[PDB]
C-alpha cells in the first residue's frame, strides 16, 4: 500500500517529515571581504547611475495646490532641468517616427 517500497540503505525515521528547508543555502565564495579597490568600485557605482538619474534620461515619473502663495511669489525654483528635447542629438540615429518630439 505504498509504504513497503523502502530501499535497504534508507532509514525509517527520516521519511514522512518532508518539509524542505525554506531556502537551500550553500555559502558561495563570492561573498568575500572588501578592500580599497572594492570600496572605490562601490563608490564609483554610487556616482554612476545616480549621474543618469540626475540627468535627463529618467522617463519614470507618473505642494500641488490651487494657488501660488505670496511666499511662492518671487521665489527660487526647484531646478531648471535639462529636458529630453533640450540637449542636441543626432537626427540620423533615430527612426522617423520619433523626430516629432524634438524641437528642431
Amino acid at each position: 500500500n505504498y509504504m513497503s517500497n523502502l530501499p535497504f540503505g534508507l532509514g525509517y525515521g527520516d521519511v514522512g517529515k518532508n518539509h524542505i528547508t525554506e531556502f537551500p543555502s550553500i555559502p558561495l565564495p563570492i561573498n568575500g571581504p572588501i578592500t580599497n579597490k572594492e570600496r572605490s568600485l562601490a563608490v564609483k557605482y554610487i556616482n554612476f547611475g545616480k549621474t543618469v538619474k540626475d540627468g535627463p534620461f529618467y522617463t519614470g515619473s507618473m505642494t500641488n495646490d490651487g494657488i501660488e502663495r505670496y511666499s511662492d511669489k518671487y521665489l527660487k525654483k526647484r531646478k531648471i532641468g535639462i529636458s529630453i528635447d533640450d540637449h542636441p542629438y543626432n537626427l540620423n540615429l533615430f527612426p522617423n517616427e520619433l523626430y516629432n518630439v524634438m524641437g528642431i
Binding site: 540626475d54 534620461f57 522617463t59 519614470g60 520619433l98
Partner: protein, 568 residues
C-alpha cells in the same frame, strides 16, 4: 514550520519563477533609468519585435508621446534596435527590438571605468586619471558624445588642447567607434536585406540550377556582409583628416560612442591572467600580463563574427565556418609576433633573468623560452606555426577553458568528491553505474550522494535503456551521458538570475530608504555628514551604505564568471 506568509516575505519565491534574462535587464533599467523605461524594456524582452502602436496597446501607458520620449531615451541608451519594414500596399511602418549589449554598459560600468583608467600607459600623474574617469563617465552616461559640445563646454584653451588628444587615443585603441546603423539594427534583418537583393538581380535561363544559384547567392551575401561589417568595426576614417597648421584631430561635427567588445577582450585577458596567477607562479606569470596586453588590440572575435546569428550555419559540409575561422586565425599575421618585437614594450621592473632553470636581461632567448613553454603547456594557450613565431588560437582554446571554468565552479559550489565524479563523467564519455567504480574507487554512498546532487542541474544527462517493447526504467539498468551544451545553458541562467536578485534587492533597499538616499545625494549634505547627521540616523545611514557597498562588491565579484560563460 515556516509559514506561507513567512515564506514569500524573506524567501522570495515570487521572483524565482521569472525568467532570469528578463529579471536582470528589467532590474538594471529600473534602478538606473526609471519605471516607465523598465516597463518598456520588459515588454521588449517579452515580445522581441513590435511597433510604437503595440507598446501603446500593451502597456498601461497609452500616451503616444510618453512612450515615444521613453523610447528615444532608451534608444540613446543603446537599449533599443530599430528598423523600417516597407509595407507596399499602404503606410510602411517600423519595429523596435531590444539591444542586449546596450545594457551591459549599465552592468559593466565599474569594470568599464576600471579598464579605461588602468590599461593606459601613463597613470602616475593624478590629474589624467580624474580627467579620463570623468570623460568616460560622461560618454557612457550621455551616449553619443559630441566634441562640438564638449570643446564648447570646456573653458580653458590649455585644457581643450588635451581632451582632443585623448579622443584620438580611444578611437585608435577601439574604445570609440563611429556610431551608425550597425549598432541599431538586428543581425537577421541585415542579412535578410542582404540576402534577397542578390536573388533579384540574377538573370534568367542561367545554365546553373537552384542549388548553384543559392550557393553563389550565399557567397555574395557573405562577401558584402563581411566587407560592410569590417568597414566600421575599426578604422581611421574618423581621424584620417589633418588640418593645416595644426594637429591630427577627429572631425568636430561627428559623434563618438564608446564600444564594449574591446573591454570584453580586456576582461577575458584579465580572467586568463588570474587563471595564470592561481596556476603558475608569478616569476614567469608577469610576462603573460603583457604577452596578451600587446596582442588584444587586434584580437579576433570571441563568440560569433555575426554571420552565425542572423542565419543558419549548415547541415552538410557544416564544418565550413569553424574551418574558415581557424584558417583566418592562421593566415592573418597581425596576431603573430617575434622575440625581437616583444622587447620594446616590456617594462624594466620585470627582470626576465631568473625565470628559467636550464637543468635540474630583457633577453630574447629567454622571452622566447616563455613563448615556447606556453605553446608546449598542457592548455594550448598558443600554437606553433613557425619555429620562432607562434600565435594564440581561439578555435580549440575556448571550449577547454570554459569547461575548466564550469568544472571548477561546480567544484567550488560542491565537494572534492563531486569534482572527482564530474571529472570522471567528463574525461570518460558514456560512464555507467560500474564504470564509475572502475574509474573512481571511492566509497559508494558518498559518490552516489554527489551523483544525486549533480543530477539536478544540466551537467549530467541520463539515458533510459529500453529492454522490452515498452520503455521502462524500472526493470533494466541505465547508464549516463554528458551533453555538455545544456550544462553551459544552466550556468548562464543561474548566474543571470542571481545578479538579477542582487539588483532587485538593492532596488528594494532604495525603495525602503528613498528619503535617506535623496537626503544623502544633496549638494550641501555631500562632504558634511558628521555634524549635520544626528548619531542614530547617521548610524542607520552608514549601516545601509556599507551594506550597499558590500553588495556592489559582491556583484562585481560575480561579474568575473558569467561573461566568460556567455561565449560560445
Amino acid at each position: 514550520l515556516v509559514t506561507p506568509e513567512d515564506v514569500m516575505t524573506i524567501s522570495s519565491l515570487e521572483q524565482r519563477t521569472l525568467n532570469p534574462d528578463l529579471f536582470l535587464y528589467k532590474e538594471l533599467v529600473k534602478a538606473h533609468l526609471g519605471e516607465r523605461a523598465a516597463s518598456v524594456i520588459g515588454m521588449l524582452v517579452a515580445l522581441g519585435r513590435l511597433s510604437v502602436r503595440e507598446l501603446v496597446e500593451k502597456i498601461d501607458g497609452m500616451d503616444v508621446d510618453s512612450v515615444k520620449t521613453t523610447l528615444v531615451s532608451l534608444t540613446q541608451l543603446r537599449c533599443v534596435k530599430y528598423l523600417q519594414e516597407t509595407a507596399i500596399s499602404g503606410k510602411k511602418t517600423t519595429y523596435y527590438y531590444y539591444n542586449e549589449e546596450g545594457i551591459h554598459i549599465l552592468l559593466y560600468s565599474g569594470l568599464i571605468i576600471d579598464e579605461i583608467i588602468t590599461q593606459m600607459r601613463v597613470n602616475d600623474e593624478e590629474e589624467h586619471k580624474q580627467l579620463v574617469a570623468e570623460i568616460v563617465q560622461n560618454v557612457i552616461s550621455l551616449g553619443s558624445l559630441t566634441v562640438e559640445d564638449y570643446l564648447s563646454s570646456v573653458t580653458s584653451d590649455s585644457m581643450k588642447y588635451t581632451i582632443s588628444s585623448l579622443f584620438v587615443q580611444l578611437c585608435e585603441m577601439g574604445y570609440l567607434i563611429q556610431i551608425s546603423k550597425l549598432h541599431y539594427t538586428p543581425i537577421e534583418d541585415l542579412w535578410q536585406f542582404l540576402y534577397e537583393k542578390h536573388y533579384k538581380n540574377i538573370p534568367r535561363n542561367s545554365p546553373l540550377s537552384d542549388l548553384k544559384k543559392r550557393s553563389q547567392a550565399k557567397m555574395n551575401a557573405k562577401t558584402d556582409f563581411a566587407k560592410i561589417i569590417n568597414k566600421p568595426n575599426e578604422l581611421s576614417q574618423i581621424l584620417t583628416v589633418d588640418p593645416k597648421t595644426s594637429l591630427r584631430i577627429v572631425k568636430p561635427t561627428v559623434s563618438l560612442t564608446i564600444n564594449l567588445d574591446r573591454f570584453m577582450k580586456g576582461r577575458r585577458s584579465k580572467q586568463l591572467i588570474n587563471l595564470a596567477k592561481t596556476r603558475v607562479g608569478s616569476v614567469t606569470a608577469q610576462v603573460y600580463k603583457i604577452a596578451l596586453r600587446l596582442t588584444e588590440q587586434k584580437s579576433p572575435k570571441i563568440r560569433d563574427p555575426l554571420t552565425q546569428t542572423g542565419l543558419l550555419q549548415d547541415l552538410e559540409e557544416a564544418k565550413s565556418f569553424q574551418d574558415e575561422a581557424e584558417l583566418v586565425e592562421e593566415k592573418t599575421p597581425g596576431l603573430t609576433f617575434n622575440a625581437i618585437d616583444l622587447a620594446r614594450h616590456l617594462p624594466a621592473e620585470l627582470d626576465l633573468r631568473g625565470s628559467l632553470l636550464s637543468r635540474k636581461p630583457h633577453s630574447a632567448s629567454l622571452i622566447n623560452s616563455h613563448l615556447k613553454i606556453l605553446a608546449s603547456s598542457n592548455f594550448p594557450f598558443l600554437n606553433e606555426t613557425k619555429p620562432g613565431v607562434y600565435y594564440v588560437p581561439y578555435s580549440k582554446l575556448m571550449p577547454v577553458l570554459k569547461s575548466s571554468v564550469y568544472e571548477y565552479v561546480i567544484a567550488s559550489t560542491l565537494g572534492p568528491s563531486a569534482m572527482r565524479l564530474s571529472r570522471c563523467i567528463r574525461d570518460n564519455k558514456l560512464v555507467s553505474e560500474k564504470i564509475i567504480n572502475s574509474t573512481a574507487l571511492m566509497k559508494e554512498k558518498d559518490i552516489r550522494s554527489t551523483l544525486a546532487s549533480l543530477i539536478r542541474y544540466n551537467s549530467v544527462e541520463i539515458q533510459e535503456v529500453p529492454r522490452t517493447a515498452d520503455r521502462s526504467a524500472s526493470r533494466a539498468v541505465f547508464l549516463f551521458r554528458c551533453k555538455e551544451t545544456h550544462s553551459y545553458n544552466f550556468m548562464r541562467q543561474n548566474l543571470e538570475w542571481n545578479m538579477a536578485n542582487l539588483l532587485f534587492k538593492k532596488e528594494k533597499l532604495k525603495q525602503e530608504n528613498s528619503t535617506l538616499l535623496k537626503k544623502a545625494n544633496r549638494d550641501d549634505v555631500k562632504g558634511r555628514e558628521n555634524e549635520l547627521l544626528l548619531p542614530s540616523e547617521l548610524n542607520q545611514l552608514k549601516m545601509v551604505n556599507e551594506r550597499e557597498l558590500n553588495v556592489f562588491a559582491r556583484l562585481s565579484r560575480l561579474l568575473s564568471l558569467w561573461e566568460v560563460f556567455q561565449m560560445a
